[PDB]
Amino acid sequence: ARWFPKTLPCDVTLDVSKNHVIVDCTDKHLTEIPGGIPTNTTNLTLTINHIPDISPASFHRLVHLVEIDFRCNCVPIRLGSKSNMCPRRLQIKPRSFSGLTYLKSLYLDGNQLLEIPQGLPPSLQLLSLEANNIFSIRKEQLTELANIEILYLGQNCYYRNPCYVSYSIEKDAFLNLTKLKVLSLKDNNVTTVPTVLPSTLTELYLYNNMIAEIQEDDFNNLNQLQILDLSGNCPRCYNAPFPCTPCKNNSPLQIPVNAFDALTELKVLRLHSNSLQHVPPRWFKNINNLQELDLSQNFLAKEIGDAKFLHFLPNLIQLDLSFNFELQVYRASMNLSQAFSSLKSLKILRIRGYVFKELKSFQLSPLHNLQNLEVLDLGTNFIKIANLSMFKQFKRLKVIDLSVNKISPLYYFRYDKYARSCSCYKYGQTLDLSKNSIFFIKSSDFQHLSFLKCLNLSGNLISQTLNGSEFQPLAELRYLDFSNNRLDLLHSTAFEELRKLEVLDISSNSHYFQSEGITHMLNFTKNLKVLQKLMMNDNDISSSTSRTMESESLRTLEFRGNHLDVLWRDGDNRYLQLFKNLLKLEELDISKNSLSFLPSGVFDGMPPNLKNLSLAKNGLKSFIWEKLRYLKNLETLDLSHNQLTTVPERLSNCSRSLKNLILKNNQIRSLTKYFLQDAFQLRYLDLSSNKIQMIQKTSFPENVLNNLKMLLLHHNRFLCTCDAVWFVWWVQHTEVTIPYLATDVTCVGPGAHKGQSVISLDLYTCEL
Amino acid sequence: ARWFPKTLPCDVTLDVSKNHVIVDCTDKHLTEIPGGIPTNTTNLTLTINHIPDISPASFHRLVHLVEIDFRCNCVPIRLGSKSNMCPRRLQIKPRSFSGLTYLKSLYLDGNQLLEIPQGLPPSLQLLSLEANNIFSIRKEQLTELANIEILYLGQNCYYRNPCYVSYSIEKDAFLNLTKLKVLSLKDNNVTTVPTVLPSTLTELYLYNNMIAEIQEDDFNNLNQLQILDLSGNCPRCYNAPFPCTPCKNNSPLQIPVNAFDALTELKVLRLHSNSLQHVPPRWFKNINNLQELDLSQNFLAKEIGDAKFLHFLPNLIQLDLSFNFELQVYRASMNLSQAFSSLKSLKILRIRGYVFKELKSFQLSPLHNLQNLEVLDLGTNFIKIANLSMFKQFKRLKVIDLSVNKISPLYYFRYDKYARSCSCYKYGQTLDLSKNSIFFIKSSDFQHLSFLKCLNLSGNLISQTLNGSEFQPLAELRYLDFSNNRLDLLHSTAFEELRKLEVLDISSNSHYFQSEGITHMLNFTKNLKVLQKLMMNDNDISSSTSRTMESESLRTLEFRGNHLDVLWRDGDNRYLQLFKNLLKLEELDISKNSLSFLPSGVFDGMPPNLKNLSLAKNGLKSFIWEKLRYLKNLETLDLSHNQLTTVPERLSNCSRSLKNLILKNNQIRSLTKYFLQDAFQLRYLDLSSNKIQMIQKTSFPENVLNNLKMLLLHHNRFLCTCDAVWFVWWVQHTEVTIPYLATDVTCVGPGAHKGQSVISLDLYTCEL
Numbered sequence A, B: 001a002r003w004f005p006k007t008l009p010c011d012v013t014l015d016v017s018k019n020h021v022i023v024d025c026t027d028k029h030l031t032e033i034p035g036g037i038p039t040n041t042t043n044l045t046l047t048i049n050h051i052p053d054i055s056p057a058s059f060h061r062l063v064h065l066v067e068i069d070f071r072c073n074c075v076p077i078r079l080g081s082k083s084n085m086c087p088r089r090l091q092i093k094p095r096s097f098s099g100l101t102y103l104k105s106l107y108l109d110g111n112q113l114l115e116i117p118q119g120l121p122p123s124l125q126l127l128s129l130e131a132n133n134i135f136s137i138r139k140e141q142l143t144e145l146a147n148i149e150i151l152y153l154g155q156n157c158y159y160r161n162p163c164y165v166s167y168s169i170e171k172d173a174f175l176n177l178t179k180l181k182v183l184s185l186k187d188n189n190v191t192t193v194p195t196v197l198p199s200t201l202t203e204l205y206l207y208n209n210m211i212a213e214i215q216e217d218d219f220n221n222l223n224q225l226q227i228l229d230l231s232g233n234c235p236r237c238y239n240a241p242f243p244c245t246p247c248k249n250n251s252p253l254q255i256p257v258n259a260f261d262a263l264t265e266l267k268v269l270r271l272h273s274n275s276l277q278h279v280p281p282r283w284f285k286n287i288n289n290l291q292e293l294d295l296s297q298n299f300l301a302k303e304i305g306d307a308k309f310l311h312f313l314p315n316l317i318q319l320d321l322s323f324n325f326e327l328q329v330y331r332a333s334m335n336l337s338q339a340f341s342s343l344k345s346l347k348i349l350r351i352r353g354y355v356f357k358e359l360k361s362f363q364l365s366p367l368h369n370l371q372n373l374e375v376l377d378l379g380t381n382f383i384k385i386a387n388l389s390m391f392k393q394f395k396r397l398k399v400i401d402l403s404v405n406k407i408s409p410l411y412y413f414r415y416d417k418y419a420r421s422c423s424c425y426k427y428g429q430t431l432d433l434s435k436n437s438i439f440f441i442k443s444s445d446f447q448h449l450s451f452l453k454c455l456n457l458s459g460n461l462i463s464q465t466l467n468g469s470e471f472q473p474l475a476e477l478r479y480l481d482f483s484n485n486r487l488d489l490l491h492s493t494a495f496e497e498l499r500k501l502e503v504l505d506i507s508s509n510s511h512y513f514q515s516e517g518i519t520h521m522l523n524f525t526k527n528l529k530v531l532q533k534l535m536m537n538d539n540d541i542s543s544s545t546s547r548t549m550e551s552e553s554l555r556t557l558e559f560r561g562n563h564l565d566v567l568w569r570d571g572d573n574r575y576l577q578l579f580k581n582l583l584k585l586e587e588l589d590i591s592k593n594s595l596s597f598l599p600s601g602v603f604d605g606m607p608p609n610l611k612n613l614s615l616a617k618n619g620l621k622s623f624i625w626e627k628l629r630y631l632k633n634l635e636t637l638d639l640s641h642n643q644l645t646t647v648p649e650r651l652s653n654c655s656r657s658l659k660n661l662i663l664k665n666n667q668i669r670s671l672t673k674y675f676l677q678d679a680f681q682l683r684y685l686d687l688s689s690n691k692i693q694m695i696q697k698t699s700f701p702e703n704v705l706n707n708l709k710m711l712l713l714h715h716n717r718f719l720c721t722c723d724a725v726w727f728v729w730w731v732q733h734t735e736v737t738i739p740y741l742a743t744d745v746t747c748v749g750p751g752a753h754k755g756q757s758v759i760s761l762d763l764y765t766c767e768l
């Protein structure tokens, strides 16, 4: 179909709507900028490569460039790879970017640059220089950036990329940048807030620095500021998973009471990890539109009980007061101030790491009349006693998170959560009791909680024989996550009281299935009349008392990580019809079941409307492809990560309906003579990570290839001799999507073509 | 330096003491018996091969053969592999074994033979024909076996190898075999006990058959019988993991009261899975020397309460009454008859699967004065309540097994446990409480059990902050298995009360290490003054409050399955000396820790007496070999299953003490010019499963190679051209142990030599 093959090692996407010709060369092991890049290229990306220098020859013909994303070409030694370390820093010669008069964005992050690149065009609106060795900002170096709007200079002096000296900023360095909206000097060893900053700033990030005190003048002219982040200045270092140095004498970040007076348009204020002991109400005197306030990782345990500053925050949407506990005090109860009732517009409230022994209904009374409250997160508190019926006065809430607690009958601790690199809530009211010490359950525990749509009891100590009476009040429940427990299916009436249950997860409940002679009733699904999805993964199921699983509604069953090779032992025909009576079953995942072979009767004993079947990671050494005729509605068949050596003689003769066939990571050395002859329903074929040497025209007919949405042939043992004249010509001139063509579709031999891509091959010698 | 290379594909071991020249060809993918087998061969083994026939040419010149082990050459379709199924049964032509006048043993198991091979020598003492299609025994066919002593004919007609008809045995078929000591007709569809059997029988096995009734005459002349096994005749099929057909009307195996009268020398009687409801005392009237009695998988729950037959068994050593529960009764208590006190010589008593709610001290009173009692196993009983202090009257016992129970504050079910294929008890008194519902522990729980030397609390629900007061009475404890629990190391005083503790297993206690911000005190080892081995595997440890683990006695630490890549994050120098203060540490396993690279300071921060270190399954892309100089007492270094591409330039310049280096399963394509030059201390090197093409004398000097105990070079990409002239010659003429030489040390190329072994290569063309 194509007259000229695309030999460039980059993915070229055209977007005529926004007029962008995008060339993506991300992680293509390039030591030079490749030749033949389109002249109309607007967005050129060369991220994760080993190009040692940039010169006027680099973007000589690409005058229409609007963005250059030249990131991580010489990433610092500690942040980057150790197998392929950068020998020398990126060298930018003069007049490299001056000729590109249309350049709006330029990312030169992770390149070990010592200074700000000079000679940049006046049309540049965004400049990113993160993870470099630029630790001294001078006014003369910023003169070229007259029209810059976004400027990232962070991660230039911190534990992962040290500079061994304090960050220096000349007085009024950013002042004459009259269009600067976003400025970020995060993770830089900055000692004072740089002044005078331009009034047009909308976002300012000075987090994870050595700023010990804020002056009252530091933000006197930032009347258009929306986001301010002064986190990690005098940090709370208890259990920090990174080198953490707190301020001397355990003092907090000293912020004057009138420091935020000029910030009338402030929406987000992040004071995370600042060792604050008090929050003065005077801070929020002129801040009426504050929507997000993060006060996590401070010493505000006593302040949570008084918190007079909450009366000055009626438009606050998000409030975070996590990990504020007194280092050596295990409180008896949580004391929330009555001022929390004045937070009329609050939707999310997170108070993790408060650390208290007992939660009571009256302790959450300041939160009763907060009509817009959606999320109440009291996780990681080590709560031992909590009457779950107290949440009957919180029916309007979407999520009630009590995860990681001791109730019985990396986000807040990571150094930089916005670091740049080179679920059942949709069902309704969720009550998360995951990672808890609940060992026994009864109907009275879930009393007055009939409104719940999802209950996550994952990671608990429940080692009970459920008989259909432990969740009687949970009538509206649609999702129950019972994973990482010790479910004992002695009675087939387990879970029957949950009549509106659509999804049940009983994965990683292997305990009773590991010991011999224990009764297991897998026929418990018959009583659940509206169950759509069931997961019983990693349960090590090798035996069952019941021979059949019945259900008139189940559409998806995940039986991964079990021992169906033991149940379907050759000669034992008892469990071959285990999934047959699941009449509406469309998806069955029976991967990771040690099935070296499939006995006769497994295909006949499959349900009638089965569409997607996965036999992946089983170690299958043989497969009777002709047996796929029994599976009349088969669309997807996943046989990845197996030891299969051959493909069927004629795939169309094995299955009339098969659309998607995944054979990746197998021992296939050759395809049959007429493999895809008349396979008209086939739309996707994966033969990657195999040992295929030759592919002929008869095996891949054109009428079948043209209907394919994608064909994967990468990581194969292709021999590129004159016998492979058809395959090399077809691959080069086809319009079929074949991923990784110019990076992992390689000739293993003969001699000269070893390690060469098939897309850049020229077999003119085979026709003289 | 051998003069003639050993090209035979079998391991030839010489034993001049017993004149045995052993030739082992087990699993060598042979389609013919290989040529050049030594003439003095006594023991020839050809197990797991595809040799289609045996003829007089097979053992023509091997006249000194005392044993032929020709097993699993045509294994039945259901028992064997499906990728390489046998096309036709093994064909034995006439006069194949008649010429071998010294043949004493002949195993022809798993070959689909239809009849007993005829023309065998008169010197044969053992003949095994298991897993074949011989289901009709005639007297004329056993004429040739006049001097046979051992004869296995089982597994010829069962679910894994059916015959579709009952097993037929002619009357007095084995009677004239006047030397027959062992006879086994197990798993054969046998309907009646064959009569008259020869009086010289010492062992008889008729288990897993259709014998519904025993006649009083069946064993009237077996006065020399020691072992009798009539198990699996009228079996108990509840939760059987194999096709199980019980006798009609739930009737047991009908055994007359005087059936065992002539068995005066009987030592072992196995009546497992016979659906017995009563055990008449009259059975053991003339059996005074019975030592083992297996009555498991029967319906003897009520009989355990009366058991008058135990008065006729004073010399019984082992008694098994497991899985005798009434299918639908959960008893309140265990009722053991007072007749158990008359078992003076009993050492092992197993009563698993009795199924009862509460164990009380007085219920075990019949076992108080049994002075020789060593093992009391009451596992798989679902016991909910049991005062552990009751075992104070059982100090003499070696093991008290209460595994798989509900106590809170494949052997019995496999078809044939003797099927032929093609721990802390040494410390002292063990109390096994594994796989139980114990969620909380205190000193009073282990009161009066100071005598215990090992306590296995593995697989329990303990989610407690141990502070050194939960095991105060356990003063003599040397081993504590606390694996598969939820250990919370809040206090560094955990386990300190166990002062004589030598081994501590806290593996698979990942729960609290998975959630952020939780305090973890790994320095708890300092208080344990005699701890020799500590295992903290699969705990997902990514953070720690303490920076150093201290111990003046710990010799072995297993830290597998953790996140040392997170603790030793580049730039974070805080946990690099975590294992340094473990001064007597000789073994450290830090495999499976996601360590793609080792930061600088890990080697310097290692303990001084570290002998063996494992960095296996880490995904290591690079390794600074020169850093091994810090580890001055290093003998073993295991870097298996990693992504290392190169070996050091000079291994001698890296380590002066390294004896064993394991580099299996890596991406090494070539060795450095002078790799093992002057590395005289090396005694073991593994370079198997790598991509090495060439090995020259400069990289592998002979003075260093000759001192090696073993050198593994299998599964490599060896190119066998004239440049590899030295490697092929050395490998052919060396006495150094290289395993898998004539099976997996193969030439990948060029053309002609593809798939050929290097041992059978002839490079005479490279020297003309």
Ligand SMILES: *[C@@H]1O[C@H](CO)[C@@H](O[C@@H]2O[C@H](CO)[C@@H](O[C@@H]3O[C@H](CO)[C@@H](O)[C@H](O)[C@@H]3O)[C@H](O)[C@H]2NC(C)=O)[C@H](O)[C@H]1NC(C)=O
Binding pocket: A157, A158, A159, A161, A162, A163, A164, A165, A166, A167, A189
């Ligand atoms: C962040 O900036 C501070 C400076 O504001 C850096 O601190 C300084 O770091 C250097 C190098 O580690 C220290 O110098 C050394 O001092 C020792 C002890 O006197 C001496 O033996 C060495 O030869 C060397 O001179 C210096 O004392 C230290 N100053 C202070 C006040 O701490 C810090 O390294 C920077 N961190 C990062 C990650 O960039």
Ligand SMILES: CCC[C@@H](CCO)Nc1nc(N)nc2cnn(Cc3ncc(C4CCN(C5CCOCC5)CC4)cc3OC)c12
Binding pocket: A465, A488, A489, A490, A512, A517, A518, A519, A520, B325, B326, B327, B328, B329, B330, B353, B355, B380, B382
């Ligand atoms: C080795 C034991 C294997 C298995 C055997 C179960 O058949 N037992 C068990 N299997 C599993 N997975 N968990 C447990 C927990 N405890 N038990 C013992 C047990 N608990 C209850 C009964 C009921 C007794 C009363 N019965 C009736 C009640 C009235 O309407 C008719 C049934 C229901 C079972 C019988 C019983 O054992 C005999 C278990």
Ligand SMILES: CCC[C@@H](CCO)Nc1nc(N)nc2cnn(Cc3ncc(C4CCN(C5CCOCC5)CC4)cc3OC)c12
Binding pocket: A325, A326, A327, A328, A329, A330, A353, A355, A380, A382, B465, B488, B489, B490, B512, B517, B518, B519, B520
């Ligand atoms: C997110 C919480 C992380 C961590 C914080 C503590 O490291 N807490 C915890 N870490 C871990 N692994 N487990 C648990 C279980 N409960 N808690 C809460 C808790 N329990 C006890 C105390 C004692 C209070 C009294 N104190 C005494 C010591 C001696 O001088 C007198 C006071 C000992 C600790 C303090 C405390 O939290 C403040 C845990």
Ligand SMILES: *[C@@H]1O[C@H](CO)[C@@H](O[C@@H]2O[C@H](CO)[C@@H](O)[C@H](O)[C@H]2NC(C)=O)[C@H](O)[C@H]1NC(C)=O
Binding pocket: A020, A022, A042, A043, A066, A067, A104, A105, A125, A126
């Ligand atoms: C090509 O470069 C332009 C200019 O940098 C990118 O434009 C940004 O697009 C996003 C999404 O529409 C906007 O939010 C930004 O405001 C745009 N930036 C500027 C400076 O206009 C564009 O995304 C790039 N194309 C691709 C595919 O990455």
Ligand SMILES: *[C@@H]1O[C@H](CO)[C@@H](O[C@@H]2O[C@H](CO)[C@@H](O)[C@H](O)[C@H]2NC(C)=O)[C@H](O)[C@H]1NC(C)=O
Binding pocket: B020, B022, B042, B043, B066, B067, B104, B105, B125, B126
């Ligand atoms: C070689 O064959 C002889 C004869 O079958 C084997 O001898 C048996 O050895 C075991 C101990 O290993 C004794 O218990 C048997 O009584 C011996 N049988 C006979 C008939 O004497 C010998 O083990 C074989 N050698 C090897 C290495 O397998």
Ligand SMILES: *[C@@H]1O[C@H](CO)[C@@H](O[C@@H]2O[C@H](CO)[C@@H](O)[C@H](O)[C@H]2NC(C)=O)[C@H](O)[C@H]1NC(C)=O
Binding pocket: B157, B158, B159, B161, B162, B163, B164, B165, B166, B167, B189
């Ligand atoms: C065990 O022997 C019995 C006969 O004693 C076999 O039973 C017959 O099997 C055939 C084939 O399935 C049936 O047509 C007969 O009706 C069966 N007869 C009876 C009485 O059951 C049985 O198949 C044999 N089993 C094995 C595993 O060899």
Ligand SMILES: *[C@@H]1O[C@H](CO)[C@@H](O)[C@H](O)[C@H]1NC(C)=O
Binding pocket: A302, A303, A304, A305, A306, A335
């Ligand atoms: C809550 O804390 C305040 C101090 O911040 C204290 O005065 C008050 O008594 C506390 N409330 C309760 C119920 O303990």
Ligand SMILES: *[C@@H]1O[C@H](CO)[C@@H](O)[C@H](O)[C@H]1NC(C)=O
Binding pocket: A387, A388, A389, A390, A448
């Ligand atoms: C739990 O709280 C409910 C009221 O919400 C009450 O009826 C019930 O008795 C309480 N249960 C316990 C065990 O305190």
Ligand SMILES: *[C@@H]1O[C@H](CO)[C@@H](O)[C@H](O)[C@H]1NC(C)=O
Binding pocket: A403, A423, A424, A425, A434, A435, A456, A458, A459, A479, A481
């Ligand atoms: C339950 O919580 C666990 C974490 O504790 C999480 O992995 C899982 O996805 C949750 N369940 C649902 C349905 O979201």
Ligand SMILES: *[C@@H]1O[C@H](CO)[C@@H](O)[C@H](O)[C@H]1NC(C)=O
Binding pocket: A467, A468, A469
């Ligand atoms: C269900 O189990 C509970 C708790 O053991 C019990 O009270 C109840 O009677 C049981 N109901 C049935 C029908 O088995």
Ligand SMILES: *[C@@H]1O[C@H](CO)[C@@H](O)[C@H](O)[C@H]1NC(C)=O
Binding pocket: A492, A521, A523, A524, A526, A527, A545, A546, A547
């Ligand atoms: C499950 O199977 C058992 C027999 O093994 C039967 O008694 C029980 O009624 C079955 N349960 C259902 C829901 O079909």
Ligand SMILES: *[C@@H]1O[C@H](CO)[C@@H](O)[C@H](O)[C@H]1NC(C)=O
Binding pocket: A587, A588, A589, A612, A613, A614, A636
């Ligand atoms: C087919 O089912 C598999 C699971 O077996 C799933 O991962 C895949 O997304 C499904 N594809 C379609 C098109 O439904």
Ligand SMILES: *[C@@H]1O[C@H](CO)[C@@H](O)[C@H](O)[C@H]1NC(C)=O
Binding pocket: A629, A652, A653, A654
């Ligand atoms: C398979 O192909 C053969 C030969 O054309 C034909 O006889 C047979 O009916 C086909 N079966 C199916 C299911 O297509």
Ligand SMILES: *[C@@H]1O[C@H](CO)[C@@H](O)[C@H](O)[C@H]1NC(C)=O
Binding pocket: B302, B303, B304, B305, B306, B335
């Ligand atoms: C033990 O069982 C016998 C019947 O076998 C019965 O007579 C006796 O009362 C039982 N003992 C107890 C304590 O229940």
Ligand SMILES: *[C@@H]1O[C@H](CO)[C@@H](O)[C@H](O)[C@H]1NC(C)=O
Binding pocket: B387, B388, B389, B390, B448
């Ligand atoms: C456990 O038994 C001992 C006697 O061996 C007794 O002193 C103790 O009180 C008992 N404890 C309980 C909880 O029954």
Ligand SMILES: *[C@@H]1O[C@H](CO)[C@@H](O)[C@H](O)[C@H]1NC(C)=O
Binding pocket: B403, B423, B424, B425, B434, B435, B456, B458, B459, B479, B481
């Ligand atoms: C404890 O029991 C488990 C099985 O429940 C076993 O794997 C482990 O080896 C036992 N511990 C010891 C020290 O033998």
